């Protein structure tokens, strides 16, 4: 904040903008409040009742999410796994050494209270349904989160996996059924169920019920896109996470990087509560999303695309960011990784290695740096008066040209529209 | 596009502003490893005038 005035009459003006809080909640800021996450569930009805309850509830349009949660608890309740090593996360020892824990050892079971639906129960529904009826209920958490109709081939592959469980499986949903389970993701207990499923079977990848992860896998790192593009950029370039952190040349991307790299959230631990910080209600606004970290998503995604990424073509272009500066940064970074291939011999036969020649005294100056050091490429870029050279724009053109089938509002169409002319 | 405004002068002002933001990327190193930052060179004295700020 600095004093601003109008020169014509020295009148003082105070330029200010409508503010938006939107504070961000980290997972560690939750377990210092409560040392356990509760799951509200109703344990009055029996298993065999709930089976037909949600079967005939599925066949029609009416179904209670309390019935599908209270049924998922009974169906998945008596499942176990022995740990090979200690399991603990955020100061919570859910297991220890050779303990044999269950899926719901991750959350503390509480009790839901209130009126219960009648539920048009059905009998003659044997136990083999519980071999796949959870897998169904779980998978519809995934299908219900995509709004493109063509994309709901996930329901067909769910039909494939259940049809693998029972050869004669057939979707107990009307074609209107796509309206039914969409609201299922709104019951916090349901999300606390799928997150517990995927968090469970992520430790036990050998278990015979690992197929249940289908549908729940979208719960891991849900609303955590930018953190994934950081690994994508750390994979496409080939540079360590620190070296890539040095190539951040924008203020917003740096602030968002510090926001993402807060050192108390276990983003490097394998089996932790962090990837499920949204469904577990650990956070209402994620710190690792492409909504609160737009400049980093645009920057890393564009830099990845210029380096021949097949994933980056369809990433979305966020709004209200410095497209110009971010594009010059991704252009310099991308041209630096593309030019400096850094080829070096790795194996030798007669213990004869490539010995470089230092006697090259011709002084080939005004040439790009030899490696990928930010310090050198910034100076070389200052020799070009901070304007991209024609070889840089031609490098980007040769990378974004021959890009076909580009969706709107994507960074692929952005780079194609920016460099191919 | 609103009516009854000075389209020409406004377009020139927005042109100079957009060209200024587009030209001046203002790239600057943000993170460092071995405490080595970009130190610009001040020994450039060929008089590279007639260049945008």
């Amino acid at each position, epitope marked *: 904040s600095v004093t601003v005035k109008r020169i014509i009459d020295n009148t003082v003006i105070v330029p200010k903008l409508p503010a938006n809080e939107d504070p961000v909640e980290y997972p560690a800021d939750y377990f210092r409040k409560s040392k356990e996450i509760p799951l509200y569930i109703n344990t009055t009805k029996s298993l065999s009742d709930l089976r037909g309850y949600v079967y005939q509830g599925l066949k029609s349009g009416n179904v209670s999410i309390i019935h599908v949660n209270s049924y998922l608890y009974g169906a998945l309740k008596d499942i176990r796994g022995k740990l090979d090593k200690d399991w603990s996360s955020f100061g919570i020892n859910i297991g220890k050494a050779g303990d044999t824990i269950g899926i719901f050892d991750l959350v503390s079971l509480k009790a839901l209270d209130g009126v219960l639906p009648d539920g048009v129960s059905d009998a003659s529904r044997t136990s083999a349904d519980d071999k796949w009826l959870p897998l169904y209920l779980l998978g519809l958490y995934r299908v219900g989160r995509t709004q493109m109709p063509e994309y709901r081939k996930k329901l067909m592959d769910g039909l494939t996996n259940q049809c693998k469980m029972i050869n004669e499986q057939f979707e107990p949903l009307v074609p209107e059924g796509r309206d039914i389970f969409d609201v299922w993701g709104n019951d916090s207990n349901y999300t606390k169920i799928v997150a517990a499923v995927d968090m469970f079977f992520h430790m036990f990848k050998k278990h015979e019920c690992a197929s249940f992860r289908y549908g729940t896998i979208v719960s891991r790192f849900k609303d955590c896109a930018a953190l994934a593009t950081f690994g994508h950029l750390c994979k496409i370039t080939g540079m360590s996470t620190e070296d890539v952190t040095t190539w951040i040349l924008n203020r917003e991307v740096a602030d968002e990087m510090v926001q993402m790299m807060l050192p108390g959230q276990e983003i490097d631990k394998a089996d932790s509560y962090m990837p499920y910080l949204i469904d577990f209600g650990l956070s209402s606004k994620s710190p690792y999303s492409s909504v609160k970290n737009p400049a980093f998503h645009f920057w890393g995604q564009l830099t990845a695309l210029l380096l021949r990424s097949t994933r980056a073509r369809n990433a979305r272009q966020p709004d209200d960011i410095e497209y110009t500066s971010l594009t010059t940064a991704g252009l310099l970074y991308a041209y630096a990784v593309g030019s400096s291939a850094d080829l070096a011999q790795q194996f030798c036969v007669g213990d004869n290695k490539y010995t470089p020649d*230092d*006697s*090259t*005294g011709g*002084l*080939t*100056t005004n*040439a790009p*740096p*030899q490696g990928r*050091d930010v*310090v*050198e490429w*910034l*100076g*070389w870029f*200052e*020799d070009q008066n901070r304007k991209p050279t024609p070889d840089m724009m031609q490098y980007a053109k040769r990378a974004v040209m021959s890009l076909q089938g580009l969706r709107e509002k994507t960074i692929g169409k952005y780079a194609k529209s920016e460099f191919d002319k | 596009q609103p009516d009854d405004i000075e389209y020409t002068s406004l377009t020139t002002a927005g042109l100079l502003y957009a060209y200024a933001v587009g030209s001046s990327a203002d790239l600057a190193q943000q993170f460092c490893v*071995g405490d*080595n930052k*970009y*130190t*610009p*060179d*001040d*020994s*450039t*004295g060929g008089l590279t005038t007639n260049a945008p700020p």
Partner: nanobody, 125 residues
């Protein structure tokens, strides 16, 4: 394995002359600014001379203008400091300095990522 190796120091009388050699190795210094610094006994290291890569543009310290001639050879990867008309004020430990590519070199020491172990220069009456 980048390193700067300084030779040529020693003890001389007032008015004598020395020649300091600096063998730079490990990488390429085509777009690098090379330099010399000196550390007085009990004092922080100070600037004496730097030679750039742009037309061999040289910058000297006021304490050595007219007495030291800095030069470089890219074909031999060497940097020389010619010390004529010496003084006891010049008694110090001289280090060779090198800079990353297209990175600036400042008299205070800013820039200059690479340094050597240095050599001893003692000037008596």
């Amino acid at each position: 394995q980048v390193q700067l190796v300084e030779t040529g120091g020693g003890l001389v009388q007032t008015g004598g002359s020395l020649r300091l050699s600096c063998k730079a190795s490990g990488r390429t210094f085509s777009n690098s600014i090379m330099g010399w610094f000196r550390q007085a006994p009990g004092k922080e290291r100070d600037f004496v001379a730097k030679i750039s890569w742009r037309n061999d543009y040289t910058t000297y310290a006021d304490s050595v203008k007219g007495r030291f001639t800095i030069s470089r050879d890219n074909a031999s990867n060497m940097v020389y400091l010619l010390m004529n008309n010496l003084k006891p004020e010049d008694t110090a430990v001289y280090y060779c300095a090198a800079t990353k590519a297209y990175n600036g070199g400042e008299t205070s020491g800013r820039g200059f990522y690479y340094w050597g172990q240095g050599t001893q220069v003692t000037v008596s009456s």
